[PDB]
């Protein structure tokens, strides 16, 4: 159920943009900043993101972003208001978020409600030990019944104390499974991450013991990461580069899978190149075997692996240079790839382009 169509009106450098985009790996090249507005900035609004009025075109009163998979829309008004819609129905932004978060994932900018959320960091590990986790859940639920009944009432509490013993007993079994399955899981992620321009990345799952039992266990499960050799581990939110976060999100996404039909990465080509850039294009390609991945890129290595190569271009319209997008046919695409390497076609550029595409 990919994002089939995208309509943007009066957003930044875009007067009117109707984009039929679909498939697996979609690459946006050309005017990269413009591409970001389409893919990161615009789609961000559909996700129920901030109401950034800076996004409204320079001399315009209001912008509109419609997306078709079912439709969702976000309208920002220079007045100070706006509106969200789900299939033509004025809904609340909170509902737009809950709905769109089942369809879209934008990385770096919106990893917070995806994999970096406290609930999902834990989920990563807990879906490797479902048996133990379900064992806890059952124990915890049964214990809540005992506590409930006991509250409904010198008075015996014999059952609730036995159940609480199981709860801790089982709860500890869970932590043991967690720590057990953590290393192999961290190892599989690092295997990929270290090929994406972070050869000395370190990563671990940390269990934090809770004061009281949670519905999800006896401990908090946190994901800690350091990109460089000299650095100390820490939250993934503490990576110095947005691009680095994106590339770590990519790795996790291909290794363990994405949870939405469409995923967006911004800047995953940021601070890398050469070998590192090829490894990224390869991971993107694989994630696209099951998903629609939308990236804006300036590296021919990445573009050449796209199922669809879009070029963001510039045209004058009412004396103003606006943005325009269009699919690349094949030979036109080959030309673009060469331009991205050599900045203009050179028999060798075409020869390098030929290989990148194949």
Phi, psi (rounded to 5 degrees) for 25: -85, 110
Alpha helices, H only, 153-241: 158-193
Residue carrying the six token digits 């901030």? 50
Indicate the burial class of 94 (C-beta count within 10 angstroms; 0-12, 13-18, 19 or more).
Answer: exposed
How many other CB atoms are there within 10 angstroms of residue 343's CB atom? 9
Distances (CA, A) of 105 to 111, 139, 324: 7, 34, 24
Give strand pairing partners of 91: 84
Indicate the burial class of 345 (C-beta count within 10 angstroms; 0-12, 13-18, 19 or more).
Answer: middle
Residue 32 marked ligand-binding: yes
Whether the CB-CB separation of 307 and 29 falls below 8 Å is answered with: no
Whether the CB-CB separation of 266 and 296 falls below 8 Å is answered with: yes
Residue 176 marked ligand-binding: no
Contacts of 123 (CB under 8 A, 6+ apart): none
Nearest to 236 by CA among 198, 263, 274, 291: 198
Whether the CB-CB separation of 321 and 280 falls below 8 Å is answered with: no
277 three-class SS = helix
Tell me the C-alpha distance between 205 and 104, whole Å: 26
Whether the CB-CB separation of 340 and 322 falls below 8 Å is answered with: no
Tell me the C-alpha distance between 47 and 154, whole Å: 55
Residue 82 marked ligand-binding: no
Residue 31 marked ligand-binding: yes
225 three-class SS = strand
- Method of determination is X-ray
Q: How far is CA 29 from the centre of its chain?
A: 20
Tell me the C-alpha distance between 290 and 2, whole Å: 11
Return the half-sphere exposure (C-beta side, CA atoms, 13 A cut-off) of residue 305.
23
Contacts of 256 (CB under 8 A, 6+ apart): 124, 189
306 three-class SS = coil
Q: Beta strands of 112-172 (E only): which ranges?
A: none
Q: How far is CA 318 from the centre of its chain?
A: 37
Q: Say if strands 262-265 and 292-296 run parallel, antiparallel, or are unpaired.
A: parallel
Name all domains of the chain by residue range, CATH numbers in brackets.
Answer: 1-358 (3.40.50.300)
This structure's resolution (angstroms)? 3.0
Tell me the C-alpha distance between 321 and 342, whole Å: 25
Q: What b-and-e string marks burial along 178-215, b requiring 16 or more CB atoms within 10 Å of the CB?
A: beebbeebbeebbebbbbbbbeebbbebebeeeeebee
Q: Say if strands 202-214 and 217-226 run parallel, antiparallel, or are unpaired.
A: antiparallel
Residue 23 marked ligand-binding: no
Q: How far is CA 114 from the centre of its chain?
A: 6
Residue carrying the six token digits 């010198």? 154
Return the half-sphere exposure (C-beta side, CA atoms, 13 A cut-off) of residue 193.
25
Tell me the C-alpha distance between 352 and 107, whole Å: 30
Tokens of 350: 């075409």
Contacts of 63 (CB under 8 A, 6+ apart): 8, 9, 10, 11, 55, 56, 57, 75, 76
Residue 33 marked ligand-binding: yes
Tell me the C-alpha distance between 89 and 191, whole Å: 46
How many other CB atoms are there within 10 angstroms of residue 120's CB atom? 16
Tokens of 49: 């993101």
Q: Say if strands 25-30 and 308-317 run parallel, antiparallel, or are unpaired.
A: parallel
E strand or H helix at 236: none
Nearest to 294 by CA among 273, 314, 272, 312: 312
């Amino acid at each position: 159920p990919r994002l089939s169509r995208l309509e943007i009106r009066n957003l930044a450098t875009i007067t009117q943009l109707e984009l039929e985009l679909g498939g697996g790996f979609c690459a946006f090249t050309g005017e990269t900043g413009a591409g970001k507005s389409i893919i990161v900035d615009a789609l961000g609004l559909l996700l129920g993101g901030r109401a950034n009025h800076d996004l409204i075109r320079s001399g315009e009163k209001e912008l509109l972003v419609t997306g078709f998979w079912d439709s969702a829309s976000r309208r920002l008004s220079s007045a100070g208001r706006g509106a969200a819609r789900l299939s033509g129905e004025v809904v609340s932004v909170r509902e737009l978020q809950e709905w769109a978060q089942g369809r879209l994932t934008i990385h770096w900018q919106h990893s917070a409600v995806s994999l970096l959320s406290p609930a999902n960091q834990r989920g990563l590990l807990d879906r490797r030990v479902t048996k133990e986790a379900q064992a806890y859940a059952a124990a915890h639920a049964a214990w809540r019944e005992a506590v409930s009944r006991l509250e409904r009432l010198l008075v015996p509490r014999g059952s609730v104390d036995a159940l609480h013993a199981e709860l801790l007993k089982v709860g500890q079994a869970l932590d043991a499974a967690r720590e057990r399955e953590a290393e192999p899981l961290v190892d599989s992620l690092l295997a990929v991450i270290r090929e994406l321009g972070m050869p000395h990345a370190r990563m671990e799952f940390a269990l934090s013991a809770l004061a009281e039992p949670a519905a999800y266990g006896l401990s908090d499960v946190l994901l800690r990461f350091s990109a460089n050799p000299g650095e100390e581990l820490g939250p993934l939110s503490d990576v110095a580069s947005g691009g680095e976060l994106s590339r770590v999100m990519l790795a996790v996404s291909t290794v363990l899978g994405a949870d939405t039909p469409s995923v967006v990465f911004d800047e995953v080509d940021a601070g890398i190149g050469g070998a590192a850039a090829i490894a990224v294009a390869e991971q993107l390609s694989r994630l696209a075997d099951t998903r629609q991945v939308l990236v804006v890129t300036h590296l021919a290595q990445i573009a050449a692996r796209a199922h669809h190569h879009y070029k963001v271009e510039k045209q004058v319209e009412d004396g103003r240079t606006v943005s325009h997008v269009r699919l690349l046919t094949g030979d036109e695409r080959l030309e673009e790839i060469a331009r991205m390497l050599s900045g203009n076609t050179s028999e060798a550029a075409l020869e390098h382009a030929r290989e990148l595409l194949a």
